[PDB]
Design a protein around this motif. Sequence first.
Motif, mmCIF file in Angstrom:
data_model
loop_
_atom_site.group_PDB
_atom_site.id
_atom_site.type_symbol
_atom_site.label_atom_id
_atom_site.label_comp_id
_atom_site.label_asym_id
_atom_site.label_seq_id
_atom_site.Cartn_x
_atom_site.Cartn_y
_atom_site.Cartn_z
ATOM 1 N N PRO A 100 72.843 40.997 18.079
ATOM 2 C CA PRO A 100 72.315 40.781 16.734
ATOM 3 C C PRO A 100 70.912 41.359 16.592
ATOM 4 O O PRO A 100 70.150 41.360 17.557
ATOM 5 C CB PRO A 100 72.288 39.254 16.638
ATOM 6 C CG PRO A 100 73.491 38.867 17.418
ATOM 7 C CD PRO A 100 73.388 39.743 18.633
ATOM 8 N N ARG A 101 70.576 41.861 15.402
ATOM 9 C CA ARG A 101 69.237 42.408 15.150
ATOM 10 C C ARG A 101 68.223 41.262 15.181
ATOM 11 O O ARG A 101 68.498 40.169 14.698
ATOM 12 C CB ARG A 101 69.164 43.120 13.787
ATOM 13 C CG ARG A 101 67.752 43.623 13.417
ATOM 14 C CD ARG A 101 67.623 44.079 11.947
ATOM 15 N NE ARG A 101 66.270 44.572 11.654
ATOM 16 C CZ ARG A 101 65.994 45.701 10.999
ATOM 17 N NH1 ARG A 101 66.975 46.465 10.539
ATOM 18 N NH2 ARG A 101 64.737 46.126 10.892
ATOM 19 N N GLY A 102 67.074 41.508 15.790
ATOM 20 C CA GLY A 102 66.038 40.491 15.870
ATOM 21 C C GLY A 102 66.296 39.399 16.882
ATOM 22 O O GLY A 102 66.016 38.232 16.616
ATOM 23 N N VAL A 103 66.885 39.765 18.013
ATOM 24 C CA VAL A 103 67.167 38.801 19.064
ATOM 25 C C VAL A 103 66.463 39.188 20.363
ATOM 26 O O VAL A 103 65.855 38.337 21.028
ATOM 27 C CB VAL A 103 68.681 38.630 19.303
ATOM 28 C CG1 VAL A 103 68.931 37.868 20.614
ATOM 29 C CG2 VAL A 103 69.302 37.875 18.132
ATOM 30 N N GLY A 104 66.551 40.462 20.732
ATOM 31 C CA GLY A 104 65.901 40.910 21.948
ATOM 32 C C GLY A 104 64.508 41.396 21.628
ATOM 33 O O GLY A 104 64.284 41.899 20.536
ATOM 34 N N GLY A 105 63.584 41.288 22.571
ATOM 35 C CA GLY A 105 62.224 41.722 22.314
ATOM 36 C C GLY A 105 61.380 41.658 23.573
ATOM 37 O O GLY A 105 61.894 41.750 24.689
ATOM 38 N N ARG A 106 60.082 41.472 23.380
ATOM 39 C CA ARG A 106 59.098 41.406 24.447
ATOM 40 C C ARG A 106 59.509 40.591 25.700
ATOM 41 O O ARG A 106 60.066 39.488 25.608
ATOM 42 C CB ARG A 106 57.791 40.898 23.824
ATOM 43 C CG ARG A 106 56.611 40.687 24.759
ATOM 44 C CD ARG A 106 55.422 40.266 23.916
ATOM 45 N NE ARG A 106 54.276 39.795 24.689
ATOM 46 C CZ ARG A 106 53.276 39.072 24.180
ATOM 47 N NH1 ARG A 106 53.276 38.733 22.892
ATOM 48 N NH2 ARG A 106 52.284 38.669 24.968
ATOM 49 N N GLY A 107 59.287 41.180 26.869
ATOM 50 C CA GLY A 107 59.611 40.533 28.133
ATOM 51 C C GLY A 107 61.069 40.516 28.564
ATOM 52 O O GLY A 107 61.394 40.151 29.706
ATOM 53 N N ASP A 108 61.948 40.929 27.660
ATOM 54 C CA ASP A 108 63.377 40.936 27.931
ATOM 55 C C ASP A 108 63.903 41.992 28.904
ATOM 56 O O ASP A 108 65.038 41.869 29.384
ATOM 57 C CB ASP A 108 64.161 40.968 26.621
ATOM 58 C CG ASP A 108 64.131 39.631 25.885
ATOM 59 O OD1 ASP A 108 63.908 38.583 26.523
ATOM 60 O OD2 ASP A 108 64.335 39.625 24.664
#
Lengths: 160, 160
Positions: A100-108
């Motif tokens: 989904p959009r807006g789920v993965g991000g920084r530190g992942d």
Amino acid sequence: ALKLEADRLFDVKNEDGDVIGHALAMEGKVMKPLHVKGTIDHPVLSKLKFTKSSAYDMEFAQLPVNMRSEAFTYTSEHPEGFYNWHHGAVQYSGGRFTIPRGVGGRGDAGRPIMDNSGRVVAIVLGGADEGTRTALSVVTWNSKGKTIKTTPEGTEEWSA
Amino acid sequence: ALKLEADRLFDVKNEDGDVIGHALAMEGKVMKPLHVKGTIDHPVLSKLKFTKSSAYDMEFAQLPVNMRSEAFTYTSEHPEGFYNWHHGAVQYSGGRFTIPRGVGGRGDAGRPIMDNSGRVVAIVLGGADEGTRTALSVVTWNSKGKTIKTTPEGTEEWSA
């Protein structure tokens, strides 16, 4: 008796102590994405000498004898379907793992994608905002054991 | 069983006796911002000869044997979040320590920013009123113990 395993994923921290990535214990080695710049939050792992595997945005070292027990098992066999990771479901279709959009991000960066048997099928390097979904940049190994780096256009680092 | 600690922060007074800044007992030494021109309100510490560390707006001296005991402990590990200092909550984000506008000012240079365990995370030199929040000019140290001085644009060195 039920089983509760020790961690096989470790944090990679920046100077301040923020988690900017992850190091995985898998198939006899400790491995993390090379772009993840920082220190592994583990007294023993943080002292090993890492070998760069630059062509695949990875770096590794053999696990200490005491950790070889507690290590993930990898599988090249991952037929189109739904997988899981720390933040939820992951879809693998057309040879691409999306979320989904807006789920993965920084530190992942460094987190694994698991199948229903608790085996790792991919290591997350980052991902691309494709509007209706996020396409993941991943590291995998084929049946023969060859390292493959698959990267969608517009992939971001997901580290700092 | 309860402790009761002597002072690890000392006033720096002007000729008129007014408090224009602070000195701190931390990691084996007394230290104060160099721009704070006054006398340390203490019979012993006022008689020590200080060594300037100009690039960092600091001045230091070795702590007498009796004060080395409960001197403040410093930590370079301070992830994003909320810290505290004499005047309230302090936010640390994007590499910057911010406080509410109209809270810090003259006399506050030399004060430490503390974490939830009673350890020192930074030393306040002054601040930059950015209309909505006040960004702090601070002295910190990295993992290797190297001095760092971070100064936001618009910084005014409190009491000079």
